[PDB]
Ligand SMILES: NC(=O)C1=CN([C@@H]2O[C@H](COP(=O)(O)OP(=O)(O)OC[C@H]3O[C@@H](n4cnc5c(N)ncnc54)[C@H](OP(=O)(O)O)[C@@H]3O)[C@@H](O)[C@H]2O)C=CC1
């Protein structure tokens with residue numbers, strides 16, 4: 001037991017695959033963030049009684065999150081890092097790799113545990129995203145496409161939306177996105193801060 005569940009990656013990126021700047025999001029989209037929270041937090045009502053989703057993130061992304069919103073509530077947080085000095089926390093798990101993170105979660109939350117894991121999300125860090133893209137359990141990408149070539153210093157590691165990856169990565173219908181997300185999601189381009197963006201869901205066969 002260490003690779004039964006599939007991994008889902010969630011990211012906001014420009015048409016040029018840009019995802020970040022000075023260790024932060026180069027855009028202020030309150031609605032986008034609302035989507036991110038909704039998607040990574042959603043659990044089927046029936047399972048909602050004792051099931052929570054997991055959010056795996058890199059150390060940089062973790063530090064980039066305002067203490068006020070740290071850690072991400074209603075979700076089990078796990079920070080992937082190799083440097084362990086005096087990183088404080090409130091029970092926040094710590095793993096040195098994506099697989100080390102999965103073994104930690106499956107061990108901490110077994111069929112005997114009170115809290116059961118529902119979905120596992122990889123929410124951040126180009127580095128962690130790079131490792132997820134290579135993981136055989138990653139089969140889904142919740143992408144928020146930003147139609148603007150905003151200046152970025154960090155980019156998504158793989159052009160999953162490009163022609164070269166079109167036989168591996170396919171974009172699902174909006175009805176399937178909502179069906180998987182469990183809720184109604186805005187369809188079409190959304191305008192916030194003079195920028196057009198929309199939600200998409202991409203999948204690959206494991
Ligand atoms: N547009 C979007 O949706 C998002 C954008 N971002 C942005 O991404 C940028 C930061 O990117 P990046 O620097 O890559 O961030 P990461 O959060 O991936 O930082 C990498 C750190 O995390 C650890 N790490 C990551 N992958 C691994 C691995 N496979 N094994 C071990 N440790 C690993 C290491 O920790 P240590 O050094 O402690 O060992 C490494 O230094 C910022 O602009 C940020 O805002 C972040 C999330 C979402």
Ligand SMILES: *COc1cc(Cc2cnc(N)nc2N)cc(C#CCCCC(=O)O)c1OC
Pocket residue numbers: 010011012023024025032033036037061064065066069072073122123124142143144
């Ligand atoms: C430090 O930048 C950053 C990144 C994220 C991760 C994110 C955002 N959007 C999409 N589509 N995918 C990912 N992985 C999230 C935030 C934020 C926030 C705050 C509070 C929210 C909550 O979920 O409870 C972020 O901070 C500016």
